[PDB]
Amino acid sequence: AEEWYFGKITRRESERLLLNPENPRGTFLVRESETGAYCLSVSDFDNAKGLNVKHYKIRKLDSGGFYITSRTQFSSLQQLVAYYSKHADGLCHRLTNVCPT
Ligand SMILES: [Cl-]
Ligand SMILES: [Cl-]
């Protein structure tokens, strides 16, 4: 889709948005790599940090495939997002909600 793609937003700006207290665990957004790669930022919770944000680097295979882990690849970012919204499979939490505002 297009709604979860926040483009050129910084890491700190994405964290300010994801730290929203009304955000369910697993709220996310995809952005451009700040450090042509992408990044999946997801909200999470634990007692030590409270609400926090995890950042996953979306890498590209030399053959043309998007991936975060070393056993799963996707033909597009939409397919990657669809996959992780159904299965956590290595991520802190599965994707549950597109980040508001
Ligand atoms: Cl980054
Ligand atoms: Cl990173």
Separation of 11 CA from ligand 2 center, angstroms?
9
Local structure of residue 71 (DSSP, 8 states)? S
Separation of 28 CA from ligand 2 center, angstroms?
15
How was this entry determined?
X-ray
Residue recorded with tokens 């926040």: 6
Q: Which ligand is nearest to the CA of 33?
A: 1
Name the token pair of 30: 């995809």
CATH of domain 1-101: 3.30.505.10
Name the token pair of 58: 């979306």
98 CA to centre of own chain: 10
Q: Which ligand is nearest to the CA of 14?
A: 1
User: What CA–CA distance (Å, rounded) separates 37 from 27?
Assistant: 21
Which residues are registered as beta bridge partners of 60? 66
Reduced to 3 states (helix: H, G, I; strand: E, B; else coil), residue 29 is: strand
Q: Which ligand is nearest to the CA of 56?
A: 2
**DSSP string for residues in 38-100:** EEEEEEEEETTTEEEEEEEEEEE-TTS-EESSSS--BSSHHHHHHHHTT--TTSSS---EEPP
Separation of 44 CA from ligand 1 center, angstroms?
18
Asked if residue 12 lies in contact with residue 31, where contact means CB atoms within 8 angstroms, the answer is: no
